């Protein structure tokens, strides 16, 4: 599932609280690299680290991983393309 | 149609007999045997039971329901108690906290307090199968919600539409900006929150436009 994909890359088992669909250029402006398709921003919140962990995949129903974005308290995004 | 507000029903009834809708209901009913589907039957049209169609003053558009147990209950962004507020909602609360003076984080994420005041929290797709986001798209829901938006656009006046994110902004492309007030910015999701949502002050502005229109402002803290 997408959760174990997150646990795999972080070592922490996170619960997806929401999945927000966004358009490629909407994502480009944030990520810096323009995805080719609509991105589903699956977000879970790590209370432990106070970080917003977001697994970005393609739209349903394939959900091919595209990037893992980690945001810290000071509002800094840490992109990690897959 | 059961679990559907009568004043909304008296105006949207024409959609229930169209084939796209009959097929949609068939498909939904079908999945609810082999997939866990959110929200439960009595909460698919919760937005229709919260207030009269003629008392709608603000419209906030969402996407599909929360695909996890105990969350989705028929209102966009809202999660029923005791489910803690999801990332996006916490950012909306964060914005309201500096936008509206007497606002205080209600601890919970249940937005029924807003719904009762005339704030329509409408999702584009009204159901999802547990754990699969955007699973029930392209099944007819978007066309039905389009009709809802369309009716409000033509038969109401001076409503304030709050469109956050490109998806929502597209669904509201046809809204008459000369008849209604539209406010749009980035989505409250942590990914785009710093792209414009934080600092947008949409809640104070919404109340300004309302008062100017001669309607009672929304008491955002009433949650």
UniProtKB/Swiss-Prot annotation, chain B:
Where N6-acetyllysine occurs, the residues are 205
Give the record's GO biological process terms: base-excision repair; base-excision repair, AP site formation via deaminated base removal; depyrimidination; isotype switching; negative regulation of apoptotic process; single strand break repair; somatic hypermutation of immunoglobulin genes
Which parts of the sequence bind uracil? 63, 77, 123, 187
Instruction: Describe what happens upon changing residue 66 to A/C/S.
Output: Acquires thymine-DNA glycosylase activity
Catalytic center residues: 64
Citing just one GO molecular function, the answer is:
ribosomal small subunit binding
* Metal-binding recorded as keyword: no
EC number assigned by the record: 3.2.2.27
**For binding dsDNA, which residues are annotated in this chain's numbering?**
67, 88, 166, 187, 189, 192, 195
Which keywords has UniProt assigned to this entry?
Acetylation, Disease variant, DNA damage, DNA repair, Host-virus interaction, Hydrolase, Mitochondrion, Nucleus, Phosphoprotein
Enumerate the catalysed reactions: Hydrolyzes single-stranded DNA or mismatched double-stranded DNA and polynucleotides, releasing free uracil; a 2'-deoxyuridine in single-stranded DNA + H2O = a 2'-deoxyribose 5'-monophosphate in single-stranded DNA + uracil; a 2'-deoxyuridine in double-stranded DNA + H2O = a 2'-deoxyribose 5'-monophosphate in double-stranded DNA + uracil
Any one of the GO CC terms: mitochondrion
What does the UniProt record say this protein does?
Uracil-DNA glycosylase that hydrolyzes the N-glycosidic bond between uracil and deoxyribose in single- and double-stranded DNA (ssDNA and dsDNA) to release a free uracil residue and form an abasic (apurinic/apyrimidinic; AP) site. Excises uracil residues arising as a result of misincorporation of dUMP residues by DNA polymerase during replication or due to spontaneous or enzymatic deamination of cytosine. Mediates error-free base excision repair (BER) of uracil at replication forks.
How is this protein organized at the quaternary level? Monomer. (Microbial infection) Interacts with HIV-1 Vpr.
| Family the UniProt entry places it in | Belongs to the uracil-DNA glycosylase (UDG) superfamily. UNG family.
Describe the disease involvement stated in the record for this chain: Immunodeficiency with hyper-IgM 5: A rare immunodeficiency syndrome characterized by normal or elevated serum IgM levels with absence of IgG, IgA, and IgE. It results in a profound susceptibility to bacterial infections.
Q: What is this protein called?
A: Uracil-DNA glycosylase
- What organism, scientifically named, is this protein from? Homo sapiens (Human)
Specify first residue, last residue and whole-protein length for the fragment. 94 to 313 of 313
């Amino acid at each position: 599932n997408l959760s174990d994909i997150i646990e795999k890359e972080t070592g922490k088992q996170l619960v997806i609280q929401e999945s927000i669909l966004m358009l490629p250029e909407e994502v480009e402006e944030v990520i810096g690299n323009k995805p080719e398709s609509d991105i589903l921003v699956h977000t879970a919140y790590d209370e432990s680290t106070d970080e917003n962990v977001m697994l970005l995949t393609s739209d349903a129903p394939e959900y091919k991983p595209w990037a893992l974005v980690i945001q810290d308290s000071n509002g800094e995004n840490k992109i990690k393309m897959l | 149609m059961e679990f559907f507000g009568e004043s909304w029903k008296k105006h949207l009834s024409g959609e229930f007999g169209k084939p796209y809708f009959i097929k949609l209901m068939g498909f939904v009913a079908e999945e609810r045997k082999h997939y866990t589907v959110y929200p439960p039957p009595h909460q698919v049209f919760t937005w229709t039971q919260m207030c009269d169609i003629k008392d709608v003053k603000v419209v906030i558009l969402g996407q599909d329901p929360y695909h996890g147990p105990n969350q989705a209950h028929g209102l966009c962004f809202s999660v029923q108690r005791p489910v803690p507020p999801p990332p996006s909602l916490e950012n909306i609360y964060k914005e309201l906290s500096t936008d509206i003076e007497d606002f205080v984080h209600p601890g919970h994420g249940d937005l029924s307090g807003w719904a009762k005041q005339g704030v329509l929290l409408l999702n584009a797709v009204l159901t999802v199968r547990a754990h699969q986001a955007n699973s029930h798209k392209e099944r007819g829901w978007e066309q039905f919600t389009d009709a809802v938006v369309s009716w409000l656009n033509q038969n109401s006046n001076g409503l304030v539409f709050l469109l956050w994110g490109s998806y929502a902004q597209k669904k509201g492309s046809a809204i008459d900006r000369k008849r209604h007030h539209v406010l749009q910015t980035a989505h409250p999701s942590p990914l785009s929150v710093y792209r414009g949502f934080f600092g947008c002050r949409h809640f104070s502005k919404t109340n300004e436009l309302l008062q100017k229109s001669g309607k009672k402002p929304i008491d955002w803290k009433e949650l």
